[PDB]
Structure formats: C-alpha cells, structure tokens
Design a protein around this nucleic acid. Sequence first.
RNA 1: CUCGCACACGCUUACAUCAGUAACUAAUAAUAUACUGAUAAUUAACAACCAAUAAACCAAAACAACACUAAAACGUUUAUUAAUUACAUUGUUAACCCAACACAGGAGUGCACCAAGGAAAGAUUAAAAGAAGUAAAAGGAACUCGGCAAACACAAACCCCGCCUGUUUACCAAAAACAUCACCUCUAGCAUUACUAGUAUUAGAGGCAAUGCCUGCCCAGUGACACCAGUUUAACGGCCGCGGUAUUCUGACCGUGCAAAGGUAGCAUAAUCACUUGUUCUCCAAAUAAGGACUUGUAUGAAUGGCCACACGAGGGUUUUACUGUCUCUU
RNA 2: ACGAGCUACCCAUGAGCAGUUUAAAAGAACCAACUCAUCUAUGUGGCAAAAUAGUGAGAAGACUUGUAGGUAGAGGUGAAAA
RNA 3: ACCAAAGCUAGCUCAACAUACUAAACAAAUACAAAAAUACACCAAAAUAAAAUAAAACAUUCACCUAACAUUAAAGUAUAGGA
Lengths: 393, 46, 240, 122
Amino acid sequence: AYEWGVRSTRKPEPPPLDRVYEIPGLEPITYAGKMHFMPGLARPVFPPWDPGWTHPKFRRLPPLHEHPLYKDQACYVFHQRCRLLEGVKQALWLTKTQLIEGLPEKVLRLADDPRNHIENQDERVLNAISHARLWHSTEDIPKRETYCPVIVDSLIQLCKSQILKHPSLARRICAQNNTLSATWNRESILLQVHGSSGARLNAKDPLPPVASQEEVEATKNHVLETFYPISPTMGLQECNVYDVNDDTGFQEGYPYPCPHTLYFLESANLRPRRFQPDQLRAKMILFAFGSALAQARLLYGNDSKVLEQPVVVQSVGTDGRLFQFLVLQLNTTDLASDEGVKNLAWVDSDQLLYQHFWCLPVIKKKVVVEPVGPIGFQPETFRKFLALYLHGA
Amino acid sequence: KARGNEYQPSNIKRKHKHGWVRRLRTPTGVQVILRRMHKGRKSLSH
Amino acid sequence: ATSVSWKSRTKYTVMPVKMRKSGGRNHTGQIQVHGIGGGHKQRYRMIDFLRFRPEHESKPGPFEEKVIAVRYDPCRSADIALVAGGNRKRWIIATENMKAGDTVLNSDHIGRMAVAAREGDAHPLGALPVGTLINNVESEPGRGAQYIRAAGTCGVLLRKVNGTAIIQLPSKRQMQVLETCIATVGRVSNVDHNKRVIGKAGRNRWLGKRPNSGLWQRKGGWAGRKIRPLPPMKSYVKLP
Amino acid sequence: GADRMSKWTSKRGPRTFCKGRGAKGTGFHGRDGKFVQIKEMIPELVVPELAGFKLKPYVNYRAPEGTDTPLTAKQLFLETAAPAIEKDFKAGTFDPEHLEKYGFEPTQEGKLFQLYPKNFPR
RNA sequence: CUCGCACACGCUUACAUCAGUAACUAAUAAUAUACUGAUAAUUAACAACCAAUAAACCAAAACAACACUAAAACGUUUAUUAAUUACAUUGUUAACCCAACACAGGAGUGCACCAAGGAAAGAUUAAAAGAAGUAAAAGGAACUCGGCAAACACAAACCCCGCCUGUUUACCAAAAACAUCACCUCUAGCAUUACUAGUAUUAGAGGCAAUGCCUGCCCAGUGACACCAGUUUAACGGCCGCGGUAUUCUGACCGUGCAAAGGUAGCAUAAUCACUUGUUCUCCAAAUAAGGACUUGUAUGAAUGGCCACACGAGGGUUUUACUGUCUCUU
RNA sequence: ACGAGCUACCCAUGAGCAGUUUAAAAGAACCAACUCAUCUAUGUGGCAAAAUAGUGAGAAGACUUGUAGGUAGAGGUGAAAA
RNA sequence: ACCAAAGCUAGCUCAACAUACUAAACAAAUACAAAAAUACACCAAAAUAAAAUAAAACAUUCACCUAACAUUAAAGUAUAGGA
Ligand SMILES: [K+]
Ligand SMILES: [K+]
Ligand SMILES: [K+]
Ligand SMILES: [K+]
Ligand SMILES: [K+]
Ligand SMILES: [K+]
Ligand SMILES: [K+]
Ligand SMILES: [K+]
Ligand SMILES: [K+]
Ligand SMILES: [Mg+2]
Ligand SMILES: [Mg+2]
Ligand SMILES: [Mg+2]
Ligand SMILES: [Mg+2]
Ligand SMILES: [Mg+2]
Ligand SMILES: [Mg+2]
Ligand SMILES: [Mg+2]
Ligand SMILES: [Mg+2]
Ligand SMILES: [Mg+2]
Ligand SMILES: [Mg+2]
Ligand SMILES: [Mg+2]
Ligand SMILES: [Mg+2]
Ligand SMILES: [Mg+2]
Ligand SMILES: [Mg+2]
Ligand SMILES: [Mg+2]
Ligand SMILES: [Mg+2]
Ligand SMILES: [Mg+2]
Ligand SMILES: [Mg+2]
Ligand SMILES: [Mg+2]
Ligand SMILES: [Mg+2]
Ligand SMILES: [Mg+2]
Ligand SMILES: [Mg+2]
Ligand SMILES: [Mg+2]
Ligand SMILES: [Mg+2]
Ligand SMILES: [Mg+2]
Ligand SMILES: [Mg+2]
Ligand SMILES: [Mg+2]
Ligand SMILES: [Mg+2]
Ligand SMILES: [Mg+2]
Ligand SMILES: [Mg+2]
Ligand SMILES: [Mg+2]
Ligand SMILES: [Mg+2]
Ligand SMILES: [Mg+2]
Ligand SMILES: [Mg+2]
Ligand SMILES: [Mg+2]
Ligand SMILES: [Mg+2]
Ligand SMILES: [Mg+2]
Ligand SMILES: [Mg+2]
Ligand SMILES: [Mg+2]
Ligand SMILES: [Mg+2]
Ligand SMILES: [Mg+2]
Ligand SMILES: [Mg+2]
Ligand SMILES: [Mg+2]
Ligand SMILES: [Mg+2]
Ligand SMILES: [Mg+2]
Ligand SMILES: [Mg+2]
Ligand SMILES: [Mg+2]
Ligand SMILES: [Mg+2]
Ligand SMILES: [Mg+2]
Ligand SMILES: [Mg+2]
Ligand SMILES: [Mg+2]
Ligand SMILES: [Mg+2]
Ligand SMILES: [Mg+2]
Ligand SMILES: [Mg+2]
Ligand SMILES: [Mg+2]
Ligand SMILES: [Mg+2]
Ligand SMILES: [Mg+2]
Ligand SMILES: [Mg+2]
Ligand SMILES: [Mg+2]
Ligand SMILES: [Mg+2]
Ligand SMILES: [Mg+2]
Ligand SMILES: [Mg+2]
Ligand SMILES: [Mg+2]
Ligand SMILES: [Mg+2]
Ligand SMILES: [Mg+2]
C-alpha cells in the first residue's frame, strides 16, 4: 500500500550505537562524567527518566486503558458536533421512530385560533427581525454568531409576553449548558447520547401525549428503512471509556423535572462549519430522544418495556433565516428488537421565516430599487413557533 | 530611482543576521568572533 | 537552510488538508524545475489509490460501497468522488459517468469463467474480459494504483497467458503484470480536459505556470520529426 | 545605521521583544492566561522586633578597635567542638564512628538549609 | 495657504520645568523643539508574554438568498490530563525614522479633509540677461528635423511594424525588442524533501507567435536517432548555369552539363547591399515626403514562417479640419 | 570569509482598489487614491551622487503593498536588457 | 602688530636572560534576538592549498612559501631540469 508518512517529516531514528558497546565484557568510556558533549568519547545510554515524585502538568499522559471506566466493549457516543450522512434515515433507524410529515393536530390547531396571537404580531416580528440583523450591533453587517442567538431569544420574549393572557407559562424556566447522558442498547451495538445543548426549557408538569391510539397501533406494522452500504454507526464517535448510567442534567427533587423544548442553534460564519438542514434535523431527533429516554427510565425504571404513558419532548432548530420544528413522542424502551412498537416524530422541514435581508440600500443607476429591510415574510413560521411554546398551556 | 537609502532599519532582521547567536552556530562564524576578540574590538557582534 | 516538506500528515482523513507550494525550489533552496510558482492557493484531498482495502481483517471478503458526491479536485486533472462504506469514507478517482447515489463494488475473487464489467467496479485483471477498458492500474499486488490516472485516459486489456495479463497503456506501450492486481473498469472522468482552451496568458498564471525564459536558443540535432520503433514490452513479473 | 555599542534592553525592540530587567519570577501562566502567582515563590521578608533592642548604626569614637583576626575554620573547631571531644576522650566515651553529637552532619540533603548547594539565598 | 490626529516599524531623552547664550549648534538676527547646566518624567484596563493528546466533521469568502472557476485565510464539541494560590515581568516622552545636513527626496494601516496644522516677502530700488505666469492688432504652421512647445482647439482618415493587457536596459534607448493565448517538434511507464504527495488528456527541454487562407521541393553534407542498412528538416542548413529557337522584340520550346533539390504559392523599390531621387498616377501654386500601381527581389520568400484582416498603441510616417506669439515681428 | 534590510525571483502571513458605465470583478471602458515614468522646460558642486513643475500610461489584475524567511560569485536570479 | 614659533616627556623599537606560555576581573547575569534564574534532548563533520610571478610568450617546471633538529666544512659538488 501507500503509507501516508514521509521519511523526512517523520522523527529520525536514533543514531547507531558506537562499536564499543558491541564488544562483550568491555566498559565503554563515555562523556557522562563531565555532563557535556565531547568529541572522541562514546555516547552514553541512559535508563528511562523516572521522577520519584509525580508532577501533574509535566508528567506523561496516562494510557487510556488506565482509566477506571475503560471497557473493552466499544460504545458509540453522539455529541453536539457529530454529523450523520443520512440524517433523517440514520436518526430514524437508531431511535426506532416513524417520520410523520406535518406538526401534530394539537399544535397546528393551537396557532390557527386568533385568540392565541400577541398584539401586533405582524409588526413586532418585523421589528424583531430588523433588530436581530441590523439594530443589535454597532457594525453595519453583524456576523452570524451575533444575530443567531438574538433572533431566537427575541422570539422567545414575544411568546413569553402571553403569560398575562395564559397565567400558566410561569411554570417554565430555562437551563444552560447542562450535562446530559442516555445509554441504550440497539441491536447488539451500544449507543449513547452524551453532551450538552444550546438552550433547554423545562416545565413542572409533563406534556400530555399527542398521538392517538390508532396511530400507535399503525406504527407496529411500519418497517424501518435500511441502507446496506452505510452502517448505522457511521457519523458517531467510538469511545472505549464510558459509564452505563442515564444521567440527566438535574439531580433528584428538581422542581422542573419535565423538559419541554430544546433550542438548537447553528451559529457559525463559515458555510462548512454549520450543519446542513438534513444533518441538523438528525441532531434534534437524537437529543430530543435522549431527554425523553432519561425521563422514561427515571420515572419508571431501568427495565425495558412499552410505556403506557408516553413522554413528549419538543425541539426547535434555527439557522438565523431557516427554521426546523420537531415534536417527538416516546413509546418504546426495549429498543433491542425491531418488531415491537415504534416511536413517532413529527418534523416540519425548512420553514423559511424570511427570504433575504438588505442591511444597506441597494442603488442601481443612481436610484433606490429595494430599500432597507427584510424581503419576503412568512408569518406562519413564527405562528408555528408560537404554537410549540404554548403547547403545555 | 533615487538610491542612497538602501538601509531600512529592522531589529528582527539585524539580530537574526548579525546576532551573537548566529555567529556561534557556524564554524566560519566562530572564526569571525575569534578575529575580533584578538584585534581588541569593543563590540564583537550586534 | 534545510526546509521541511508539508507532507507531514500520518492519518488518512477525507477533509481537505493544508498545502504549501514549492515553486521549483528543492530542500536546499535553489531552483531545480523552472516555470513553476505564483499560483492560486489550493487545498489537498487525501486520495485512496488502493481500491481494495477492507475496514477490518476479520472479513477479507469483497465489499460494496456507495457514492455520495462527485467533486472537482484542483491538484489532479480528473474528478474525484466521495465514496462511503461501513464506517469510513474515501476519496477515489471517478470514472467517466459516475454520479451521486450510485453503488460501486470492490472485489478480488478471481473466478474461472468471467465477471460482468460495470462502469465503476474494481476487479482483478484475471477475472476481467479480454476486451475491457481499464484505469488505475496496479503494477504489483498490493502496491496500489500508479498508472492511468489522468483525465480521459483509459487502457485496454489485451490477453491473459499462463496466468499473466498484458495491458496497453495510453502511451500505446504494452505492459505485463500479474493477473491478481486490482484494476478499475471504465474511462477517467472529465473527458474534455484536452479540448479545454485557455483564453489568456493570465489563466496560465492562475494555474501556477510562470512564463518561459526569453533566451533565444538555436535548435540542435535533437529536433526534427523522429520516427522510432515501439520499445519492447515492460514486464514486472519476476521469472524464477 | 544603528548603534551596536549600546545596551540591548526591552525598550529598543518591537512589541514582541519584552525582556525583563532582572526581576525574579513569581508565578506562571494558568488556563485562561491569567497569571497564577505562587505564594511560596514570593520572598517572605522576615523581620525581628527592634522596639526592645538597644543598638545604634554608629559607634562611639572613644571605643577602641581590635586586632583584625579573620575567623578561621580551625579556630571555630577549637572553640566549639574541641572541648566536647577532649572531655569525651579523657573519659573514654569517644566514638570515631559516629560524630553527629559534636555537630558533624554526613549528608546535607536531610536538613532544611544545605551548605554546599547553598539552599538559602541570604 | 492648506497632508491633519493616532497606531505599527524605526530612532533613543533629542520631550517637560527653570536659568544662561561673549563663543559653540540653526547655513542670518530675534531667540530656544534643535546649543549649554541643574531638576524632573512615561503608573494598565490597551499591547507583548499567554496548554497537550485522541475522536466526529466532503459542502468558500463577494450585504450571501444562491452561484461562477482560478476551487479558496478564517473551528466548534465530546473524551483524557493541566501547579489553582489578591497584587508577576515588560513597551507607554518627543517637534522623531532611512537619505553625509534641521535636504523641494523615500515611507505601511485606520479615520478625517477639518473643529486640525501652518507662513510664499530680512529691508529697498523696479537696469540688462535668464526662469515661471497672464493678455494681444492683421495673418493662422508662412516656424521648424517634426504642430516640439503653447492654444477659446480636445475632431476625421490612410500606411508601416507588432495581434491584444502585460514586461525590460534602477541612473542617456519603454521600442518594431522579450513574454503571451494558438500551433508544432522533442525526451520520459514512474513513489516517500524538487518535478509530486502527481502518472502520457500527465510533466519537463525548446521553436514560432491569436484568428483566417497556407506552410512548396531537398537526408548530399553536418547533427541527432538507429547506435546495422537506414530514418529525420514546424533539426542546423540548401533550394542552378551555357547556347540556340516564332519577320523584329520577347522566349512556349530544343541541345548540353552539374546537383540532395534547383526559389513553388505569395508579396514587392519594402525597415530588404548598391544602382536609387527606379518609372507612372493621385495629393501640393511648387513633393528626395505619403498613399496606389508597374516590377528579376540575380542579395524577397513560406513556424530562423509567407500573406490578409478586426481591435489595440505615451512606437514610426503622411493628410484634412479646428485652434493658437510657433512664426511674418515682436510688445 | 562576509552580504538578498536596496534589487531579480520564490515560499509564508497580512492589508488595499472610492465613484461612473454594463446580464459582467470581462487580463472591457471613463476617472481618483495608488503604481509606473512618455514628451518638453528648469536643474547640471542642483532641493536631489537622477529631483521639481506641466503633461502623460495602467488603475478588479500577468495588479500594487507591509512584516518575515529562502537561493551567494567557477555562483544566485532573469516575461535575455549580457 | 596678528596668525604663529620654540621645549622633552609620554611611550616605542631591536635583542639578551628567563620562568616554561590565553593577562587583569569574575557577587549576579552571559550562545531565547548573548549578558533575560527555572522543562523531556538529538548531536555533530573531514577531501593534496591555489595563483599573482620567473622562463623576457606559455602549456612540463618556478627557491622561501604548513610540518627541518642547529652551527664550521664536504658544496653550490654528486644529481634533478621544454637538460
Ligand atoms: K481538475
Ligand atoms: K532620536
Ligand atoms: K523637412
Ligand atoms: K510602455
Ligand atoms: K543526413
Ligand atoms: K509604395
Ligand atoms: K507603445
Ligand atoms: K533572506
Ligand atoms: K531633494
Ligand atoms: Mg550606503
Ligand atoms: Mg523594504
Ligand atoms: Mg499542481
Ligand atoms: Mg512555452
Ligand atoms: Mg523566444
Ligand atoms: Mg555603524
Ligand atoms: Mg519593544
Ligand atoms: Mg514602537
Ligand atoms: Mg493576575
Ligand atoms: Mg541619527
Ligand atoms: Mg533659524
Ligand atoms: Mg529660556
Ligand atoms: Mg535642553
Ligand atoms: Mg543642504
Ligand atoms: Mg518666509
Ligand atoms: Mg530676500
Ligand atoms: Mg527682464
Ligand atoms: Mg495665453
Ligand atoms: Mg494675435
Ligand atoms: Mg513649412
Ligand atoms: Mg523654412
Ligand atoms: Mg524626431
Ligand atoms: Mg504638444
Ligand atoms: Mg514606408
Ligand atoms: Mg505590443
Ligand atoms: Mg501586421
Ligand atoms: Mg502596453
Ligand atoms: Mg534607462
Ligand atoms: Mg522599472
Ligand atoms: Mg525613458
Ligand atoms: Mg493547423
Ligand atoms: Mg501566424
Ligand atoms: Mg515576438
Ligand atoms: Mg516576426
Ligand atoms: Mg518549410
Ligand atoms: Mg543518409
Ligand atoms: Mg502587387
Ligand atoms: Mg509588405
Ligand atoms: Mg535598397
Ligand atoms: Mg521622413
Ligand atoms: Mg512636412
Ligand atoms: Mg507601395
Ligand atoms: Mg535569401
Ligand atoms: Mg530552419
Ligand atoms: Mg529571412
Ligand atoms: Mg481582439
Ligand atoms: Mg497611431
Ligand atoms: Mg489646415
Ligand atoms: Mg527581501
Ligand atoms: Mg471601482
Ligand atoms: Mg481595464
Ligand atoms: Mg513630475
Ligand atoms: Mg512638468
Ligand atoms: Mg503652462
Ligand atoms: Mg488612462
Ligand atoms: Mg486602455
Ligand atoms: Mg551566507
Ligand atoms: Mg551564471
Ligand atoms: Mg521581470
Ligand atoms: Mg539580444
Ligand atoms: Mg549586446
Ligand atoms: Mg613569464
Ligand atoms: Mg620583464
Ligand atoms: Mg608555487
Ligand atoms: Mg629525461
């Protein structure tokens, strides 16, 4: 084969030993006595350096297998920055779900009612977009890492103002950079969702089930799509050190034990840095399942069985101009077999909130054709955004 | 087109080309130091 | 002063790697090849020449992979295609009509009768039909593809005698090689690279070629249309 | 050109060149780049109590001088260790093997303030 | 009247307060940012110094929605480690640097063109000559190598050589020279520092210059290859005499000789030895100029390229129109 | 032996090109900053051991430019001007 | 009458003798860009000296020219040289 090393770039091998060391029963004469190099004297051979007392920073890195949690079985870990090729298909396969196009009827009918709209919904959102992209920064062209979290937080505040009309939104609170872990066995291979999230919303009361029993039974006969050349593991991180313990972000007795909404933000200036929309939807599927799986085992036990009371977790992905919406319901814990009841997940793909924005007025032939402000606006994207936020109430 | 200002000062370049460290890295450079020490120079190198 | 070559990466990775131009200067620092330098900055893609390479040694059997996308590689004159299978991805040279969402079979089992020649499959020269167009020729078993990789270049198998295959290189020179070497069926992509026309002197500078020297050299005896018989067949088979 | 016969200090070079003027380091760089100053490396000045101490920086002019006799390693031994050794040998208790009771120390690394390595600054 | 504030690079107290200048420094005097003596000063938040390994990740910056070819600087997260302990060290002035000078020169970035920064005349007289600027009667290139310079002009056309943008003799030549897209010849079957992390649609050693129509004949010599016969000129190079012949002129033709073949197509008094101011026509009142033809150029000529054309030119030559102190002729 | 802090070329790492005309960021066009130096006049121990004034060519590219590194005299480098 | 003129020390040269030959100063900092207390290394090397000149040119040759252990003689002798 063609090994990728280069002789010049690789570290040189040690120089050949002097001929004196090859003579049996002959003590070589070295310059180690004078502790400096001298021509004509043999080069000493020293034993490996052994510091009597260990020092934290300057010691060599311990081997991986020295860690107490090291295990022979290879566990696959999915953190935030893992990319899946067949994002919708791999996430569906690893989670044993059935993709249903369109938001659930409870969510969609919760936004079409005019009695659930903020005052000046059209105007305020238009101000929110302008504030996010042009007004919030002193610079003329704000970068994406600045206006990606601003636009999401601004829209959260708009739907937060509905607490006066619905005095039950006070049961929610946000959490930041929590540590989440959920390990499950899936067809003779071990998977684990480990890492953090952008923004998390938790509520005191659990979210009611959203799928009718007719759809759950229809899920039994659904067969998961398969792809032969690509293994389902591809895209994950193979870790030999791990702990088999489903650890959520909070300790026992937390007054907000039921997660409600996950906010994933792809904020990065460069195009290759950000997730593709297909891969971004995969990121939401697994993390929404990991939070759902943690509740399903904390509230019921480590035993794997079908859940009589489903757990519902929502998640919203944002690019700064394009949105992704996901509502996931968890029904099955025994994921080893593929013949039982599958889970459900409603996904709306590529909800375009606005087409384009012009920070500066474009001038063609000394006249203004398109003034400053967003071009094209779809209020339904925010209307669906408002629907998910008010789902609990 | 108007010569005479060929010397553009720079401390990074001056200490890298005529520095004391460079003079002691080449066998010919060390002989330069030896000649200036023998002659009695006040400054062996930059 | 001795310089350091940029080819220091040890582990294969599909993502583009940083690249430093040379300009014809050797490690010493003197010009050795003229007319090179001042090109557009480029990134290098790690190309996997060895078509047959199992993920693990537990299962040495033939495996089948899937093509994801076909991209443009600034370094070589051909087009490379991303290929994924199992738990790894590879950049391999795409043939004439390789597209996205396609399946490519890699195998080494030398069968007696034959194997149907597809446009992307890689099979040993012992199982291919006599009249097959091939590229990425492996000179020795396990050495890797070295020959026939330029754009639009395809070699044709001639005959298989006493367990040894003879192929025709694009230079119309016959080459003898053991039949167990892996080769790819088809013609290399970007067929009309030869018909590309450079519109101005600047486009040469963008590619990275400096203009020739202005010294006027009188032609010697080397010039003139030379008619020479074809050199004999080059054989890499070691006869015991 | 430039002056090659002057002192090369931190003020002459660019912003990259920052050479200390001779101070002793008191720490290192931490994780975030904030300078972590080690408490031990700071020289803790030790001072006595001069309130109940009667002595002045000047001596009276009428006070006589003395014959300048520099202290000798031989004179110190005859003053401190000789009386102890002499009495023990006359009583028959002298032990040539062990001399630790007379103030001799075989290895310096045991004690806090070595002598040949010169552990203490002053 | 307008190159102003600040940082980087550089210089190194030349900066500040007070006092002195008979003399030293300023190309003079007053005088003191520039000469002498004493004293004093730049305080970190800004800037320098400011972790390692393993793993996941094919998807450009141009308001970036999405695309082009020349394929593009710009990283996050998970895992294993990382002395944990107020106050560390260092750069903070300036009218400044490189050019022998307190030099009309050279000098990167940000923001302004000012709210900031500065003084063309030491005092007179108002000669010639010289430099720079404005105006002019009638004429408008009659000046002169040339319309150089100047102008209330700021247009039109022909030709020669190069196709074009570009490049070169820093400090007498910026061109018709070199490069260049195109075409063609030649040498190479391939691995860890160039060529190349490439593999004959590739890469080097060269010639000639886009395009269009073409690139004729010649391996005798030399060179190269074959390394033998031999093969090669888009390899170096070459590509003919004498005599007679249709009334006269011309010479289709014929005799004879030598060669490896005897200059083919084209163009042409040309940037092409001399003859030469060839001859003729057009342009002008007048033409050694310019364009168009005639043409043995016995020394034009076909990739050491011939020929034709669009576009282009601070190249070279000519004509018309408009302007003007170039000039009649200076004030 | 010492020299690539000027210059020829290259490898790194950075930074500039406003307005105007066009489906054009097209080695297109008008014109600044910026970079070269065509023609003439002053200057000729000069302000200057190659400059000043007027006028000019390019000005989204084979373009200018800062920092730093590489090639050294039987050589380096060269869009050949010895 | 100005500008000027005069002085005799500083030290040096060549030997001899001679110990036997990198002085004086080294508290701290000195081969990071020397004079900057403090971190996992790489370290190092040799290949005949050539020519200016003489032979009235210049190609074989051209004393001394790095390494001889001296002096009185043998002797500018034997020999080696485009002899
Ligand atoms: K290519
Ligand atoms: K200074
Ligand atoms: K004339
Ligand atoms: K020019
Ligand atoms: K021949
Ligand atoms: K003519
Ligand atoms: K020109
Ligand atoms: K250098
Ligand atoms: K000047
Ligand atoms: Mg000089
Ligand atoms: Mg410079
Ligand atoms: Mg290349
Ligand atoms: Mg060429
Ligand atoms: Mg040429
Ligand atoms: Mg000097
Ligand atoms: Mg400095
Ligand atoms: Mg500075
Ligand atoms: Mg601190
Ligand atoms: Mg100075
Ligand atoms: Mg003055
Ligand atoms: Mg004063
Ligand atoms: Mg002063
Ligand atoms: Mg002067
Ligand atoms: Mg004045
Ligand atoms: Mg005057
Ligand atoms: Mg006058
Ligand atoms: Mg006038
Ligand atoms: Mg008049
Ligand atoms: Mg006339
Ligand atoms: Mg006349
Ligand atoms: Mg002339
Ligand atoms: Mg003129
Ligand atoms: Mg002519
Ligand atoms: Mg030209
Ligand atoms: Mg022409
Ligand atoms: Mg030009
Ligand atoms: Mg010149
Ligand atoms: Mg120039
Ligand atoms: Mg000139
Ligand atoms: Mg042709
Ligand atoms: Mg041509
Ligand atoms: Mg040419
Ligand atoms: Mg020509
Ligand atoms: Mg020919
Ligand atoms: Mg022959
Ligand atoms: Mg003609
Ligand atoms: Mg002609
Ligand atoms: Mg003539
Ligand atoms: Mg003429
Ligand atoms: Mg005339
Ligand atoms: Mg003519
Ligand atoms: Mg001729
Ligand atoms: Mg020829
Ligand atoms: Mg000719
Ligand atoms: Mg053209
Ligand atoms: Mg012209
Ligand atoms: Mg006229
Ligand atoms: Mg340089
Ligand atoms: Mg512009
Ligand atoms: Mg242009
Ligand atoms: Mg000028
Ligand atoms: Mg001028
Ligand atoms: Mg004028
Ligand atoms: Mg112009
Ligand atoms: Mg132009
Ligand atoms: Mg050197
Ligand atoms: Mg040379
Ligand atoms: Mg050049
Ligand atoms: Mg020439
Ligand atoms: Mg010449
Ligand atoms: Mg001689
Ligand atoms: Mg003589
Ligand atoms: Mg000699
Ligand atoms: Mg003889």
